[PDB]
């Protein structure tokens, strides 16, 4: 879990257990193409390779082979009108190579105004014969 103080360990203690986990994981289509065994995750910055391996293996039952993590530095050059630097959050990206020769690719998700259309198609735009007169007067 995150934002919690952990029980400390002394030699011979019990196993530290998190019976109601706090972590929240999302996953993203890689920006530059990745091996067919790699899945790319965003995980909270208070999380570790061992945590993520156990996290996936325990919750989802997806056998993981290896994990490598990288902490991305959000940009801090984008100034508000007060001229205050505004920094979007740093994040942690985890590359997870699956085991047993499996393969994966992020599937392609995502595969009152009738009045304006109807009045525009029947707008009766300027008939250049008319030369600018109001047409409508049947007189």
């Amino acid at each position: 879990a995150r934002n919690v103080v952990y029980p400390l360990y002394r030699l011979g203690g019990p196993q530290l257990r998190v019976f109601r986990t706090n972590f929240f994981i999302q996953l993203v289509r890689p920006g530059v193409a990745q091996p067919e065994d790699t899945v790319q995750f965003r995980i909270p910055m208070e999380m570790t390779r061992v945590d993520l391996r156990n996290y996936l293996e325990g919750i989802y039952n997806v056998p993981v082979a290896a994990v490598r993590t990288r902490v991305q530095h959000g940009s801090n050059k984008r100034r508000d009108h007060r001229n205050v630097r505004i920094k979007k959050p740093d994040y942690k990206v985890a590359y997870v190579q699956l085991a047993h020769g499996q393969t994966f690719t992020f599937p392609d998700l995502f595969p009152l105004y009738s009045m304006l259309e109807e009045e525009r198609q029947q707008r009766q735009s300027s008939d250049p014969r008319r030369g600018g007169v109001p047409s409508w007067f049947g007189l």
């Binding site: 009738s114 109807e118 009045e119 014969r129 600018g132 007169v133 047409s135 007067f137 049947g138």
Partner: protein, 185 residues
């Protein structure tokens, strides 16, 4: 947005046995006679067109519908319009009666009228100032079937009527133009 109008026309009568529509319409108000429509139709038409000369902006808003105000006003904006009705020969009359759910009526008119529209510098561009010319017109009035005013919705042009008057101005119509490579072939 509670439009006061009815988008399009359900069945626009074709220019040259509807009591169910009467039952479904007059019920919602319960005080009306179709034979009371001719006088009101001519009165609203003439007073509204006089107001078009006046340029009383609010009165035109109250009389005409949303689909009818802006197109008239924009052209009439920044150019005087000296419209005038004169003595009529033929009484107008209902053409039919048509029924979220807002109703429609149509009226046939054969009038004697005059137009004179001047440029924003005062120069004539259309119509003759005082010639009383006969006209035939088909006009649809929409009825907002609470307190729905019986406004003039639109006028419809019949394809079997003579064309429009000439125009005192000379006009070009640039059609097939040249291209930097595509020739006039």
């Amino acid at each position: 947005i509670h439009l006061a109008c009815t988008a399009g026309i359900f069945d626009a009568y074709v220019p040259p046995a509807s009591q169910v529509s009467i039952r479904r319409i007059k019920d919602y108000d319960a005080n009306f006679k179709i034979k009371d429509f001719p006088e009101k139709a001519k009165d609203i038409f003439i007073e509204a067109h006089l107001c078009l000369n006046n340029s009383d902006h609010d009165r035109l808003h109250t009389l005409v519908t949303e689909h009818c105000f802006p197109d008239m006003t924009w052209d009439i904006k920044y150019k005087t319009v000296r419209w005038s009705f004169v003595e009529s020969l033929e009484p107008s009359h209902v053409v039919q009666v048509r029924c979220n759910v807002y109703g429609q009526i149509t009226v046939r008119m054969h009038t004697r009228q005059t137009l004179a529209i001047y440029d924003r510098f005062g120069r004539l561009m259309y119509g003759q100032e005082d010639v009383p010319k006969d006209v035939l017109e088909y006009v649809v009035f929409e009825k907002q079937l609470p307190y729905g005013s019986w406004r003039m919705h639109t006028k419809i042009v019949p394809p079997w009527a003579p064309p429009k008057q000439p125009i005192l101005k000379t006009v070009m119509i640039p059609g097939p133009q040249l291209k930097p490579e595509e020739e006039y072939e």
